[PDB]
Amino acid sequence: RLQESISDFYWYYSGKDVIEEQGKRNFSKAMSVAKQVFNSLTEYIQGP
Amino acid sequence: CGGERYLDFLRFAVFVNGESVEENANVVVRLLIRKPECFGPALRGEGGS
Amino acid sequence: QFLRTDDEVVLQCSATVLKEQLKLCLAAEGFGNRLCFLEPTSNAQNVPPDLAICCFTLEQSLSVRALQEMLANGHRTLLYGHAILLRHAHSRMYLSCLTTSRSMTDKLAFDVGLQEDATGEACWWTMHPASKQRSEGEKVRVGDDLILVSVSSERYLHLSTASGELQVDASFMQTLWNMNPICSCCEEGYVTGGHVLRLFHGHMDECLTISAADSDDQRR
Amino acid sequence: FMQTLWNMNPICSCCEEGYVTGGHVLRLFHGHMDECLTISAADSDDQRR
Amino acid sequence: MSFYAALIDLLGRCAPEMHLIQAGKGEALRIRAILRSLVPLDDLVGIIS
Questions:
Q1: For the modification Phosphoserine, which residues carry it (chain B)?
Q2: Chain E partners (3+ C-beta pairs within 8 A)
Q3: Three-state SS for C88?
Q4: Which residues contact C52 (CB under 8 A, 6 or more apart)?
């Protein structure tokens, strides 16, 4: 669901040319969360 | 009698000062249409209008 | 297994009339009648249903956003909540919703019709799951039950029955539509059903045929 | 007073975990999350039919 | 009389927007088509009498 949200957010900015300051402050918030989720998924598999 | 009271509230959430704020207004019409029974059965129905 | 893009399919609805279930599909002829009607397919053992015009095909599938950003300017799998672009196979015209008046229901009927509408304003539908078992962002099981909503007008495609025969429009309530995988990406150089083709006989130049035109033999 | 010939009978033994066996008391969900089979409620003349 | 008069009052100010948006965009025109299709003008003009 989070992945469907970012891809969504991309279309809203597909037609623009520069991302305004408040278009990045929220954007970096979401991507930081996605990184933390990915870290967990590895630690259910590491140590086969 | 009951219907005239609920709707009076919605009038104050579509505009605030001289015909503005449409984001909540946009979702009102798209949500109100979903339930056709919201319209009085005298019109917007199957029998007659 | 699951629906994919570039697949040919047919719609299907089931509404009993004589206290027995009658299967009804959606089809239109194309050139000369922009409207659409229903074709009963309940007596296949005696009445041969016309499936030459019932075939549809799926060409595009996008999220609502993606659609709205495209409006200003491979092979995917369908998920509930996405949009869709139907396409009639034979006449090569896009299914849409018109702005005419008709049908007993009338009111907000807005009877269905297909003209050319490649331009994306009223030629798109979003599909939602029917019961609480399913949810958004889920893969579409073959043979599920769908509810279709117009992107532009925001009305369910309603099987509106009235005093007359059964008519289709988008006015008042839901209509349970069951999908049907007519076919998929077939293999090259192999005979498949539903093709139109000739029957040679012998070795080089001989073929099946019927009597010529302008005769009283009634082509028998 | 006297003997009585009793024949034994192995109803069951140490079954396997996580598998349905006969003679259990258990519920019947339907659908996906929250739905189950049931009968009519108490204090009614329907005789639970 | 109070009900239906108040309902159309709601769907007169729930209009898409002033012509600031309706003359330079294509999103708001979708809403205008919907609400205009529910109240025919022929009957509406005659009601003021």
A1: 20
A2: B, C
A3: strand
A4: C90
